[PDB]
Design an enzyme around this catalytic site. Structure first.
Site, PDB file in Angstrom:
ATOM      1  N   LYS A  54     -15.142  77.541   5.957  1.00 54.50           N
ATOM      2  CA  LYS A  54     -14.682  78.622   6.831  1.00 54.50           C
ATOM      3  C   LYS A  54     -15.419  78.639   8.162  1.00 54.50           C
ATOM      4  CE  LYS A  54     -13.005  83.355   6.766  1.00 54.50           C
ATOM      5  NZ  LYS A  54     -13.665  83.727   8.031  1.00 54.50           N
ATOM      6  N   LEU A  56     -15.769  76.228  10.052  1.00 48.53           N
ATOM      7  CA  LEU A  56     -15.082  75.331  10.955  1.00 48.53           C
ATOM      8  C   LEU A  56     -13.918  76.042  11.623  1.00 48.53           C
ATOM      9  CD1 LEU A  56     -14.822  72.175   8.693  1.00 48.53           C
ATOM     10  CD2 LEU A  56     -16.648  72.670  10.348  1.00 48.53           C
ATOM     11  N   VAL A  59     -10.183  76.952  10.152  1.00 48.91           N
ATOM     12  CA  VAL A  59     -10.226  77.283   8.728  1.00 48.91           C
ATOM     13  C   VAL A  59     -10.539  78.757   8.556  1.00 48.91           C
ATOM     14  CG1 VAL A  59     -11.341  76.939   6.506  1.00 48.91           C
ATOM     15  CG2 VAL A  59     -10.998  74.970   7.998  1.00 48.91           C
ATOM     16  N   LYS A  66      -8.249  78.656  -0.973  1.00 46.10           N
ATOM     17  CA  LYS A  66      -7.606  77.501  -1.579  1.00 46.10           C
ATOM     18  C   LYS A  66      -8.626  76.392  -1.900  1.00 46.10           C
ATOM     19  CE  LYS A  66      -2.949  78.294   0.128  1.00 46.10           C
ATOM     20  NZ  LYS A  66      -3.129  79.734   0.363  1.00 46.10           N
ATOM     21  N   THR A  95      13.779  65.480   4.844  1.00 50.13           N
ATOM     22  CA  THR A  95      13.329  65.550   6.234  1.00 50.13           C
ATOM     23  C   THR A  95      12.586  64.296   6.694  1.00 50.13           C
ATOM     24  OG1 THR A  95      11.192  66.678   5.786  1.00 50.13           O
ATOM     25  CG2 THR A  95      13.163  68.083   6.143  1.00 50.13           C
ATOM     26  N   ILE A 100      17.190  64.442  10.380  1.00 51.57           N
ATOM     27  CA  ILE A 100      17.335  65.520   9.411  1.00 51.57           C
ATOM     28  C   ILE A 100      16.097  66.385   9.538  1.00 51.57           C
ATOM     29  CG2 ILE A 100      17.506  66.197   6.947  1.00 51.57           C
ATOM     30  CD1 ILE A 100      19.045  63.780   6.349  1.00 51.57           C
ATOM     31  N   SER A 174      -0.884  55.563  21.692  1.00 48.80           N
ATOM     32  CA  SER A 174      -2.155  55.037  21.193  1.00 48.80           C
ATOM     33  C   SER A 174      -2.301  53.547  21.504  1.00 48.80           C
ATOM     34  CB  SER A 174      -2.282  55.277  19.689  1.00 48.80           C
ATOM     35  OG  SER A 174      -1.436  54.410  18.957  1.00 48.80           O
ATOM     36  N   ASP A 186       6.480  53.819  23.201  1.00 42.93           N
ATOM     37  CA  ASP A 186       6.770  54.828  24.218  1.00 42.93           C
ATOM     38  C   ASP A 186       6.660  54.172  25.586  1.00 42.93           C
ATOM     39  OD1 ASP A 186       7.516  57.425  24.902  1.00 42.93           O
ATOM     40  OD2 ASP A 186       5.474  58.224  24.880  1.00 42.93           O
TER      41      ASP A 186
HETATM   42 NA    NA Z   1      13.501  64.271   9.903  1.00 36.65          NA
HETATM   43 NA    NA Z   2     -13.196  79.356  10.717  1.00 42.10          NA
END
Ligand code: NA
Ligand code: NA
Length: 327
Positions: A54, A56, A59, A66, A95, A100, A174, A186
């Site tokens: 937490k 960080l 977070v 979790k 997806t 999609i 990149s 790209d």
């Molecule tokens: Na997609």
């Molecule tokens: Na935090």
DNA sequence: CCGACGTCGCATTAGC
DNA sequence: GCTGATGCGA
DNA sequence: GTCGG
């Protein structure tokens, strides 16, 4: 840091991210989980508790909870459940098809269309982009090794110059930062005859030539300034054919070119650091321009930019190589 | 407590 | 027919 | 979901 350190946690967060985006259609929660997964991935210690995490940035209370559950049990009940869910896992899966999104995926799964086979059976319900995405489902998820990117760049720079030797083309992403592998290509294109204050077949002529030499194989979308399509390196004799690859080509006015090159060279982290620097010097930098503020905060007009360095020099930074722009 | 969280070109589509 | 909204991707 | 006005 080695994956083994908090890979269980970051994988968990990435999965949650995907379900938020694809199933819950909650794009901001999607980006929340990704941001948390990134910062944890760069944390050089094995996380011992949610409370530790937490600290960080990105977070918060719920992700801390979790992590506690994951650490104490090695799983997450909510994730186990949604993983198992026929409808949700099918929506999430579909997806992965380019074209999609969450909305198309939801609509397909509503009417019983759940797998790549179901898509293959129902092509008339797919739009052009989706058909191409389905056709190259496997290829599009493969990475591109740098050696192939270089061969791809060879073809692009050559064919662009053959159309008109006054074009300027730059492969960004990149790859330009020297990455060993890429997800797609790209290409940023300009021409002295195209400025902000001024043909709209500059892009078409280059796409046409790349199709003519059979480099570009399919078109996802195409207008006067942005092309998105598919390409393939020619096959080396009796060798196996190369995967089909995603290529984008955008035409940018000359006076906005280097701002564009900077922006699409990234990385995303480096861009925001640089965008911060940044305002402080009294400058606003976006994809297109750099502009001066502005005692109130009123942006003046775009400053003349004739290279990347020109931008760095506006904000009194020393030019930094693309290889040195991970942050 | 509650809004921001990136922005926009192109394809598809909803409404007139 | 046109214009605007939405989905999608980057 | 997280941050911060
Ligand atoms: Na997609
Ligand atoms: Na935090």
């Amino acid at each position: 840091p080695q994956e083994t350190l908090n890979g269980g946690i970051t994988d968990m967060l990435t999965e949650l991210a995907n379900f938020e985006k694809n199933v819950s259609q909650a794009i901001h929660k999607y980006n929340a989980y990704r941001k948390a997964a990134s910062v944890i991935a760069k944390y050089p210690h094995k996380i011992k508790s949610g409370a530790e995490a937490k600290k960080l940035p990105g977070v918060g209370t719920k992700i801390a909870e979790k992590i506690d559950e994951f650490l104490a049990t090695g799983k997450l009940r909510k994730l186990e459940k949604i993983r198992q869910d026929d409808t949700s896992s099918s929506i999430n899966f579909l997806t992965r098809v380019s074209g999609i999104g969450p909305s198309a995926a939801r609509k397909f799964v509503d009417e019983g269309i759940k797998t790549l086979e179901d898509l293959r059976k129902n092509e008339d319900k797919l739009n052009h982009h989706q058909r191409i995405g389905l056709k190259y489902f496997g290829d599009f998820e493969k990475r591109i090794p740098r050696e192939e990117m270089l061969q791809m760049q060879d073809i692009v720079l050559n064919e662009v110059k053959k159309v008109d030797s006054e074009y300027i083309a730059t492969v960004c992403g990149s790859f330009r930062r020297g990455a060993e592998s890429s997800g797609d290509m790209d290409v940023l294109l300009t021409h002295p005859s195209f400025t902000s204050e001024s043909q709209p077949k500059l892009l078409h002529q280059v796409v046409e030539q790349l199709q003519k030499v059979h480099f570009i194989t399919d078109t996802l979308s195409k207008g006067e300034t942005k092309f998105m399509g598919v390409c393939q390196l020619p096959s080396k004799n009796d060798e196996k054919e190369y995967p089909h690859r995603r290529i984008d080509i955008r035409l940018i006015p000359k006076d906005q070119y280097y701002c564009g090159v900077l922006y699409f060279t990234g990385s995303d982290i480096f861009n925001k650091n640089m965008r911060a620097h940044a305002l402080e010097k009294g400058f606003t930098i976006n994809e297109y321009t750099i502009r001066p503020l502005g005692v109130t905060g009123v942006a003046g007009e775009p400053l003349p930019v004739d290279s990347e360095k020109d931008i760095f020099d506006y904000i009194q930074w020393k030019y930094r190589e693309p290889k040195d722009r991970s942050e």
